[PDB]
Amino acid sequence: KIVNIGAVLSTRKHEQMFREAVNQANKRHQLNATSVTHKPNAIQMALSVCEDLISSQVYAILVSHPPTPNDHFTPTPVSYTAGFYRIPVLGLTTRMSIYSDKSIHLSFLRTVPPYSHQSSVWFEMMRVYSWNHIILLVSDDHEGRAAQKRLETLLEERESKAEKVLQFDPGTKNVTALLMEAKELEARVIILSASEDDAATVYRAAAMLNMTGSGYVWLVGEREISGNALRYAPDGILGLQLINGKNESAHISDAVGVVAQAVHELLEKENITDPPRGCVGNTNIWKTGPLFKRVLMSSKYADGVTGRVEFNEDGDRKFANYSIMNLQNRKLVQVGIYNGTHVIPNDRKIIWPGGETEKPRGYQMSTRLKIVTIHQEPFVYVKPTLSDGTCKEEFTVNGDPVKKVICTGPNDTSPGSPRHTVPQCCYGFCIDLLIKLARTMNFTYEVHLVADGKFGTQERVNNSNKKEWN
């Protein structure tokens, strides 16, 4: 009646704890256990996993993140080796979203939500605080891409879209060119998604550009407020943390309970094929592997240490507790707790960047209204200005002065020319209407022509099938 199970842990003490926990689970309701520590060389580590657990015919592999802070150090080789036989592994403390793509990792159930799921929390923070116009800073990795995709596919339901989405490159130390673009936007709330080093770099770049002043609100992921970022984060960061996210012990206990429950459910089913005894010399998919993964992905464990353990369709834990954290005097302070589809605040004060104690709406009205205008004869006359700086002062037949604007457009009307953005003087019917609107609409217009010099239709992109507006 032996049912084996395998696990790869960070240290021997955690291995002994896992053995004690699995013994307690067995005593609660005939089930073996084995363990092995991590190894530096990924290839050798995977070979050891293969030759130790697979030779022992395990049913699941409990994999946990190692002490060293290296991305994809533990899970990827173990996940690949197990998914070769469709043996379902249980991640413990790895929040990278690359494991949420079942196309690559065929069998990977984990008991912590990914970093991408934090996107949903942002929506909740945008709901209670009534924020609709946001900007989103995202790295060009799978993690950032996944976070952006989740946020967009969850925001499109509310018929809302981000004001701008700005991409990164994983390692660039110069992002001020992008913060310059971020300056000229009405949305004044920034949602970051980047690693600790990239978070520190963007914090350093934004500090010199006064994006940390009053009227700005920052929403920042869990891993972008820990470490060096915590040293450079401005006051008022609305970061997130997991409840017992780093607690390997609670996750180990909860995962072994879930796996024991799933094994008990499985052995009561119809004929079940044993897992292959030897990793070497075997190239067949474990026929009951997909069934075991399916029953794992649907088992409900409402008696867990970390609360109810329910997996979503993608194979990741759902309804996880997120704790909000505001940075005050260079020290994180608990503010609220989000459990699921609802964020709850507390009596602790929330000081936004700049020291404001209100709920600053990040919708700078701006009222600049950069205006384009085509040169049309009866409506918008365009003429060269004088050397004094301003265009001359004509007069109407009735003696009234004619209103003129400092148009910024290209002198060379000839196509295929090095267009020079020189200021002409433009005036006329449409210009007079614009003056009336500005006088009544509080406008501060910056009129400028169009480089194309055309009204603009939907032109097909050169050597493509995409529509484009000129």
Partner: protein, 462 residues
């Protein structure tokens, strides 16, 4: 200077020694001489594959690798990607499982495959629809890894096209074989083209339910990705006849060509690296080198891989890691229940073989066509005038009708190609009005044998 070629020797019986003799000895005079070490794998076990690749990296100091197995398992691609990422050796899978392409590869990994990504399959699907005037379709997907990416790409291509498709409901079956919400969701399909996207096992159930619901017939065409027709030798009984699918070329461009192309690609990349960097790359001492942390101070081979030309064909690779010019042969379930080619993906054109749809009959219990008609016409009078398809959004745009002529190839060549044209006029408007009122479908085509008609030797013409 050293290239390793590894096979599974299952689907390659004669290639046990044929791979060794087939090298770039006379294929090209590359500036760098390379020797091909041929290996055969009894089984592609993970530990066994790790050991074999590590031995090949240690012994003979290979500068690259070409891998192709007969296994249908998809984990081989993942394992190869991981090995390429850690060992720092360029690995390409010419055939079988290694052929399958993973959505996302590790940035460190230098793994390349000959397969086609789901984006390319979707775009050739939409090209098939455009070439057959199937401008109304109802995308349906199950909960399968990669369904969200496929749906998003299809929607984006729909929104950014001048063709203007009437993309209807995009159903997502949250649970196959549920028979509770799947039935009511499928019953809303009033369209004529369905982009099924499901696993090979789940697609059988979906198609059986569709037949048991009335969604299979003459007026319904199912276009289907490669992963549903992965094994063309196993055709389930529930698969409807004339079911369009897009896959890689199993028939033409085989091993004797796949391995040649892979070796040529690797040699061209090495030559480009030598042209850019005077020093040649040095292989890692061993994979089991846990104590010593390695690196790649020299530039890796991705740039070389991109701008690669060999034996005329452009076997370049995209920035993501997909082949720029895949094969992507279109196939259809013939009335004899055997997949057959009806078009090979070209440079950037569909190159369909059937100008007019075959109108394949589904399961033998289906009714005959009492509404579809074949109509012959002459494009001489102003009542019927032909016109080439419009440049932007190539199709019959406003008042014209798909209208195929039989144009003789060249001048003296007896070959004749059925070209699709848009013919309009007074009689075409009459036909359109008649179809609208009488409620029938037509397949217009011009006549080739003479004018309106004359009795020649008691045989009618035209």
């Amino acid at each position: 200077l050293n290239i390793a070629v590894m096979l599974g020797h299952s689907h390659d019986v004669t290639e046990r020694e044929l791979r060794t003799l087939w090298g770039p000895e006379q294929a090209a005079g590359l500036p760098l001489d390379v020797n091909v070490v041929a290996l055969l794998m009894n089984r592609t076990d993970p530990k066994s594959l790790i050991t074999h690749v590590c031995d090949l990296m240690s012994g003979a100091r290979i500068h690259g690798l070409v891998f192709g197995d007969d296994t249908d398992q998809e984990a081989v691609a993942q394992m190869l990607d991981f090995i390429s990422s850690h060992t720092f050796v360029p690995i390409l899978g010419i055939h079988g499982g290694a052929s399958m392409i993973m959505a996302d590869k590790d940035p460190t990994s230098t793994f390349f495959q000959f397969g086609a990504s789901i984006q390319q399959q979707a775009t050739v699907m939409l090209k098939i629809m455009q070439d057959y005037d199937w401008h109304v379709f109802s995308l349906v997907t199950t909960i399968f890894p990669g369904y969200r990416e496929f749906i998003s790409f299809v929607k984006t291509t729909v929104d950014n096209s001048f063709v203007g498709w009437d993309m209807q409901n995009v159903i997502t079956l949250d649970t196959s074989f549920e028979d509770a919400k799947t039935q009511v969701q499928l019953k809303k399909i009033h369209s004529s083209v369905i982009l099924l996207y499901c696993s090979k096992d789940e697609a059988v159930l979906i198609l059986s339910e569709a037949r048991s619901l009335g969604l299979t017939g003459y007026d319904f065409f199912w276009i289907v990705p490669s992963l549903v027709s992965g094994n063309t030798e196993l055709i389930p009984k529930e698969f409807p006849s004339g079911l369009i699918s897009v896959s890689y070329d199993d028939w033409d461009y085989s091993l004797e060509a796949r391995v040649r192309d892979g070796i040529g690609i690797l040699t061209t990349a090495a030559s480009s690296m030598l042209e850019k960097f005077s020093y040649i790359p040095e292989a890692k001492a061993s994979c089991y080198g846990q104590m010593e942390r390695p690196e790649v101070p020299m530039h890796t081979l991705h740039p070389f891989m991109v701008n690669v030309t060999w034996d005329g064909k452009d076997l370049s690779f995209t920035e993501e890691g997909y082949q720029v010019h895949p094969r992507l042969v279109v196939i259809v379930l013939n009335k004899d229940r055997e997949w057959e080619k009806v078009g090979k993906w070209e440079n950037h054109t569909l190159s369909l073989r059937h100008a007019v749809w075959p109108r394949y009959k589904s399961f033998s219990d289906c009714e005959p066509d009492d509404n579809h008609l074949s109509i012959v016409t002459l494009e001489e009078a102003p009542f019927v005038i032909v016109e080439d398809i419009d440049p932007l959004t190539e199709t019959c745009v406003r008042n014209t009708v798909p209208c195929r002529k039989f144009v003789k190839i060249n001048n003296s060549t007896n070959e004749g190609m059925n070209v699709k044209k848009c013919c309009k006029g007074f009689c075409i408007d009459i036909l359109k009005k008649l179809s609208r009122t009488v409620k029938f479908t037509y397949d217009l085509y011009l006549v080739t044998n003479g004018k309106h008609g004359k009795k020649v030797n008691n045989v009618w013409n035209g």
